[PDB]
Every structure is written in C-alpha cells, then in structure tokens.
Write a structure and sequence with these properties.
408 residues, mainly alpha, 4 chains, 17 helices, Piezo1, part of a larger assembly, membrane protein
C-alpha cells in the first residue's frame, strides 16, 4: 500500500511538471521547486517484599503459561484415567470424550478435588508459589539449563575435556529442526558418562559439576518423554524455510558491547594478549552489520561455524583468567543468539532503527544516550551506506541520516 | 623527610600551562552550545514535524524495495525542503 | 569547490536511479571504517609496547659479605668477583 | 631483570586519562562533520553556481582597476544574495 501511494504521487508530480528523457542523477537531484509542496488533502517491609515477589512470580507465571496449560490438561486427563483405571484400559479416543481433536481448548468436566488442591495452594501464596513456580519454570524451559551447565563446567578450568561438547552443542542443537535432534541427547549423555568414567587415573570440582550435568541431561530426557554424506542434507534443511522468521540484532550487538566493556575492564602477559582479541572482536562487530544488512543467512552460518571454533582455539592459549572466562561466557550469549538468528532466519522488510519504534520519553533518553558514545553514530551511518543498495553519494547520505536523527 | 616524586614530569612551570590549557579548551568547548543556539533555530523549532517524518520514512522505505529511481525523486523534495525555510513554515504547520 | 564538483559531473554523467558504484562504495568506505578503528586502536598499541620490553638480565658482579660480632670490629670479612661467581649452566638449572 | 623507564612521566594513573582525553576530543571533533551537515545545506547544494561566480570574479576584478566605489555597489549584491535564500533559489537555477 505504501509503495502504491508513493508511486501514485510521483506520477502526479511528473504529470504537471511539463504543464522523462535525459535525466542523469545530477539534474534529478537538483530539481526541486515550490510546486512540490501543495496541500493535497492530507490522506512494614513485608508487604513490599511479598507484593514485589508476587509480581515477580506473576512474571514467572507468564513465562510458564504454556507448559502450565499442557500440565493441567494432561493431569486432568490423568486423574480421569486413574479414577477410570480400576478395571481396564482399552480405548484412547473413547476416553477423550467422557468429559475436539487438535486444539488447545477447555470446555469439559471439573473434578472438585482438583479445585480443592488449587484452593489449598492458593492458601499459601507467600513463598510456596514463588519457588514452586521457579521449579515449574526450570521444568518448563527445561532445555536451556542443559546448555547452561554444558558451558558452566567448561568455564571452571576444564581445558580440553569439555571443549568437544559446546562446539557441537551450538552446531547440532541450536541449528536444527526445533526439536533439537533424534540422538544428540544420546551422544551427549554417553560422552558425559565416559568423561567422568575416564577421570579415574587413580576430578574435584569438575565431577562436582558433571554430576549436575548428567542429572540435568536426564532431567530433560525424562521430561521430554518423546522420540560427510549427511552434512549437506541438513545444511540444505536450513534453507527449506519452515521457520517462524523473527530476528534479533539488538541483543547480539549489545552482548558484543558488553564483551568489549569486559575486555577494557580486564586492564585492571595477558594484558599484552588481550588486544589481538580486541581487534578481531572489532572485526566481528564490523562484519555482522554487513551480514545483517545484505539480509543473507548463508554467510552468517559460515561466520558462525568459523567463529565458534576460532574462539575455542583461542580458549587454549590464554593460559601461558576469571575475567577472561567471564568474557567467554558473555560471548556464548552472542553465539546462542546468532544460532537463534540462523534458525528463524531474517524476516524481510525490516531495516528501521533499533531504538525508534515508538515515541516514548524512554526512547528519547536512550537515543540521546546512544549518540553520546564516540565513533558510533557515524560508524553506523557509514556501514549502513556501504552495504545497502543506495544510489546517492556518501556525503549525500549523511544529510538524510542527520535530518532523520534530528527530526526524531 | 623524603619526597615521593611529584614534579618529576613538568619541571615546575608545566602545570599552570596544563591547567590553563584544560580550562581554556573546555571553556571554548562549553560555550559551543550554551551561548550559540541562535543560528540553529530554524532547524530546531518546528511545531509539528509529521510531514517531514513521513517523507523520511519513505526514503528509508524505498531503500529496501530497491525501486531505486524513487530515492532521487524524493531526496530532491527533502533537500529542497531544507533549502528554503519559508517553505518549511509552509510545511510544518499544525492540523485542524 | 562547488563549481569544480559540478564540472566533474559533466565529463562523467551517471544514469538515473541506478549505477550505484559497487566497488567505489568499498573504496570510499573501507578507508573510513579502518581509519576510525585505527583511531580507536593504535593509541592502545603504543600504550602497551613501552611496558612490554624486558629481559636485559642484571647478573650481579659484586658480592661483599662480612660477619660482624660486636661493635668493636667486623671479625670476618670478604668480597668476591666473577672468578668466585658461577654463572649457571642450564644443566645446573635443571639440577636446581 | 632491569626495567627501562616507561611509567616515568604519568605515575600510573595518567595514561587512561590521556587516552580517554584523546578519544573524547577526536570523537567530538569527528562528529563535527559526519553528522552535522544539515544546517549548511542551503549554502552547499546549489544546482549551477555560475551567476555567483561571475559576480565574485567581478569583485576580484574591480579591485585591480581601482575603481573603488564599484566594490560597495557589488558587495551589497553579494551580501544580499547570502541573506535571503529564497533569492538564492531565484538566482541559482539552470539554463535553457
């Protein structure tokens, strides 16, 4: 509709111009006149603590809601089945109607005992519902903490043992069809078994976290309860487009800014070694702009598979540390979000600006914050001009990118 | 008593120069925008900027449909809006 | 300057709406991005490389040692020089 | 091992100040002309500047014939050309 209206106006102004040949990019720019601007119709503390943590567990209710509905409908059908299960069980759809096929609806019977259990837990909304909803949270997400512990045993001094897990954690699990794999969990759990079995040349903190890694893996395994000639297949499956197609650029670059703050925080040997990482970090922070701006997905995948093993090879030669592994952990967020970006895959027709979506006072404060840091607004306006399809010069572009940023 | 090193980098007469350099450069910086906002009035005191903002979102918009001859028939309207402030007052009114 | 940038158009007119200078974009832009990264970066190189150079060893040529019992006189004294100093061989470094 | 002098001029805490001073002053210098070319549009985007250039060569010209009352009857035309941008658009058109 917008492109329709714009072209319909420009044909109008090309009509009454003569009342077109040999226009050559410097006689179409310098042709503006007053007739372009006609008005054409314009078409004591305990209440604070209890209330704030009840709001926080309300936020956690909002996080848990869909697994909560799944659990509620399955426990309703469960208790109907068990109170049925006195003599026999022989039919599945025939017990689906003693109270329609593929929905998420709830228009059925109601056992008052289950309501009484809900009333009883409604008696104790002080701390019980809070940590109960926390357990329901980690049972609802139930997959992210597998990745969390897989990174978290690697951050505590695990040199080459738990390096082989996070590489294929990213590469397999976060790049595939949304139900991470058939068997990645199996080749996870057998390696995490034999990794602690082979720690028997006879460790202290590593096994102390690997037992948690095992039980988290089996926790997700039970909670899931459903189950060189092949790289090219699923790599093509990355380009079959069944995806939901959302994005996030705003958190990748934010995490990389936090990354560079961590590197600068590391200045109070390895300070001499920080700076090659700093420059190649800048190179990544440059090139991902172009990856986002040509709207290409294959280059981001190639950049992913290069960058993860490059930074993991750098996770050897730092040691000839705590801020360095913190830095490693904070860019694992960047790799995870990058893999999310690979999976959903760049919704079209969104260029915009990262902070200008609704004219709130918060937005205005954050925008004037963003234009305060040195070398950032003009770096954005230069790397935007290089890779986007435009027909102006460089200095003819920055007039637009300043008129806009003042009018906003 | 001993003296830890304090004048070991300016030979005595090299801080009054440094301090007066600091105060001169930050003074004639800070008089940049607390006593010069007269010239940039006519680009900063518009009543209702919406007819600029629609056009500038259109120049942002066409850049992704790649109908690239439609930039330099809008960009002319923008530059000519900034070259004749009379027709900024003809274009930044209020509505009814 | 405006007249020269007008006449340098006339010898090289560009077609309307297109001809978007694909190599020339990298040409004018890469110098800018690498220059600004260098302005950030190269001050943080010569910040580091003056505190890095170290390794000129100071093997002490002089040992003087005395045993002084009482304030009356140092009873034993001696000094020694590099005939009575052993620079290590790396075999003896592995021994230690 | 020995250390050649490296912190002998800032006492440790006197480079982070110096480096952040360098990057702040060159940043708020380099945002001088990469994100402020909006105000100086109407003196930098003329289509065809020839009717200014003839007049300015005449102000250069009369200055050597020493018919000196002919400067301040041309210089008025120049200053009045720069005081009313409406009549810059009435005077910097193209030809036919």
């Amino acid at each position: 509709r917008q492109m329709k209206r714009i072209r319909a106006k420009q044909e109008k102004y090309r009509q009454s111009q003569a009342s077109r040949p040999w226009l050559d990019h410097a006689t179409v720019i310098h042709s503006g006149d007053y007739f372009l601007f006609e008005s054409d119709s314009e078409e004591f503390l305990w209440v604070l603590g209890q209330a704030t943590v009840d709001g926080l567990t309300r936020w956690l209710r909002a996080f848990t809601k869909h697994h909560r509905t799944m659990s509620d409908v399955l426990c309703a059908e469960r208790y109907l089945l068990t109170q049925e299960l006195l003599r026999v069980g022989e039919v599945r759809r025939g017990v689906l109607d003693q109270l329609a096929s593929e929905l998420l609806l709830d228009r059925r019977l109601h056992i008052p005992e289950l309501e009484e259990a809900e009333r009883f837990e409604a008696q104790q909304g002080r701390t019980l519902r809070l940590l109960r909803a926390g357990y329901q949270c980690v049972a609802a997400h139930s997959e992210l903490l597998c990745y969390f512990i897989i990174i978290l045993n690697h951050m505590v001094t695990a040199s080459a043992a738990s390096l082989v897990l996070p590489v294929l954690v990213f590469l397999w699990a976060m790049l595939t069809i949304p139900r991470p794999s058939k068997r990645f969990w199996m080749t996870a759990i057998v390696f995490t078994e034999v990794m602690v079995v082979t720690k028997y040349l006879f460790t202290d903190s590593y096994i102390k976290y690997d037992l948690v890694q095992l039980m988290a893996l089996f926790f997700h395994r039970s909670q899931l309860l459903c189950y060189q000639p092949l790289q090219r297949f699923f790599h093509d499956i990355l380009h079959t487009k069944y995806r939901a197609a959302t994005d996030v650029y705003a958190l990748m670059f934010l995490a990389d800014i936090v990354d560079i703050i961590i590197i600068i925080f590391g200045f109070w040997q390895v300070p001499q070694a920080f700076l090659f990482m700093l420059l190649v970090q800048f190179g990544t922070m440059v090139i991902d702009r172009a990856l986002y701006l040509r709207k290409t997905v294959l280059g981001k995948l190639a950049f992913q598979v290069v960058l993860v093993v490059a930074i993991h090879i750098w996770m050897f030669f730092i040691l000839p540390n705590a801020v360095a592994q913190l830095w490693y952990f904070v860019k694992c967020i960047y790799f995870a979000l990058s893999a999310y970006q690979i999976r959903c895959g760049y919704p079209t027709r969104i260029l915009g600006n990262f902070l200008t979506k609704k004219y709130n006072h918060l937005n205005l404060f954050l925008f004037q914050g963003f234009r305060l840091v040195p070398f950032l607004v003009e770096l954005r306006a230069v790397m935007d001009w290089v890779w986007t399809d435009t027909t102006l010069s460089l200095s003819n572009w920055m007039c637009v990118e300043d008129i806009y940023a003042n009018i906003f | 008593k001993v003296s830890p090193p304090s004048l070991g980098f300016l030979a005595g007469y090299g801080i009054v120069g440094l301090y007066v350099s600091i105060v001169l450069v930050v003074g004639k910086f800070v008089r940049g925008f607390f006593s010069e906002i007269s010239h940039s009035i006519m680009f900063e005191e518009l009543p209702c900027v919406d007819r600029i903002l629609k056009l500038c979102q259109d120049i942002f918009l066409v850049r992704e449909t790649r109908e690239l001859e439609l930039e330099e028939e809008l960009y002319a309207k923008l530059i000519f809006l900034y070259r004749s402030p009379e027709t900024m007052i003809k274009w930044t009114r209020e509505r009814e | 300057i405006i007249k020269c940038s007008r006449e340098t158009e006339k010898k090289y007119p560009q077609p309307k709406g297109q001809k978007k200078k694909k190599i020339v974009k990298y040409g004018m832009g890469g110098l800018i991005i690498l220059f600004l990264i260098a302005i950030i970066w190269f001050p943080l190189l010569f910040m580091s490389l003056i505190r890095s150079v170290v390794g000129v060893v100071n093997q002490p040529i002089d040992v003087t040692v005395t045993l002084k019992l009482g304030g009356y006189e140092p009873l034993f004294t001696m000094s020694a020089q590099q005939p009575s100093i052993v620079p290590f061989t790396p075999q003896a470094y592995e021994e230690l």
